[PDB]
Amino acid sequence: MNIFEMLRIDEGLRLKIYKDTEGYYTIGIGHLLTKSPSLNAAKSELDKAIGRNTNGVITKDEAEKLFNQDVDAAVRGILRNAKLKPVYDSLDAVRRAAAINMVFQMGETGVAGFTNSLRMLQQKRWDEAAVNLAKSRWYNQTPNRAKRVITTFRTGTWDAYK
Ligand SMILES: CC(C)Cc1ccccc1
Ligand SMILES: [Cl-]
Numbered sequence: 001m002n003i004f005e006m007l008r009i010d011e012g013l014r015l016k017i018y019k020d021t022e023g024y025y026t027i028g029i030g031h032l033l034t035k036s037p038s039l040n041a042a043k044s045e046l047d048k049a050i051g052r053n054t055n056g057v058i059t060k061d062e063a064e065k066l067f068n069q070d071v072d073a074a075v076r077g078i079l080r081n082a083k084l085k086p087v088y089d090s091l092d093a094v095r096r097a098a099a100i101n102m103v104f105q106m107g108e109t110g111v112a113g114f115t116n117s118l119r120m121l122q123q124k125r126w127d128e129a130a131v132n133l134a135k136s137r138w139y140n141q142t143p144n145r146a147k148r149v150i151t152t153f154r155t156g157t158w159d160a161y162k
């Protein structure tokens with residue numbers, strides 16, 4: 001298992017514009033296109049991302065290319081974040097993948113309110129962190145996904161994904 005496979009499970013793969021769990025125009029492997037309610041705005045953003053007139057549809061290769069860029073960016077985002085970097089660097093490889101999944105899903109900003117959990121992870125208090133992470137809107141809105149990521153931080157194994 002690895003970060004790509006993990007996310008491919010959590011996000012799925014769709015070749016036509018769709019609305020995510022929050023109702024936002026997305027395509028591919030969880031690539032958010034826009035928070036705007038306009039499908040045209042979404043199609044424009046898609047064309048700009050692909051570099052061609054897609055008409056709202058892409059190929060598997062193009063989806064994977066967006067995915068590669070998005071994963072790279074998430075990691076790069078963590079490393080540039082003074083609050084996140086130190087925690088991430090303290091983690092083992094499996095748990096790093098759980099951290100990337102969360103940023104990928106919610107952005108650096110989305111995980112801004114996770115101070116207490118960050119500290120707990122930094123201190124390697126796994127069960128406690130697991131409990132703290134569950135007290136979140138994230139968990140209440142996407143519970144099956146949150147449970148998988150949480151078990152991952154709790155155990156440091158890929159058990160939730162097998
Ligand atoms: C925001 C916490 C809970 C998870 C996380 C840890 C370290 C870097 C990025 C994410
Ligand atoms: Cl892009």
Ligand SMILES: [Cl-]
Nearest residue numbers: 142143144145
């Ligand atoms: Cl879910």
